Amino acid sequence: AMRLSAFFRQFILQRKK
């Protein structure tokens, strides 16, 4: 159940980044 592709710092962080 992993969608998380370019994960990290881009989804979670998409808003900070």
Swiss-Prot record:
Q: Where in the cell is it found?
A: Secreted
Q: Which domain of life is it from?
A: Bacteria
Question: What family is this?
Answer: Belongs to the ComC family.
Q: What does this protein do?
A: Acts as a pheromone, induces cells to develop competence for genetic transformation.
Tell me the protein's name: Competence-stimulating peptide type 1
Supply the gene name. Answer: comC1
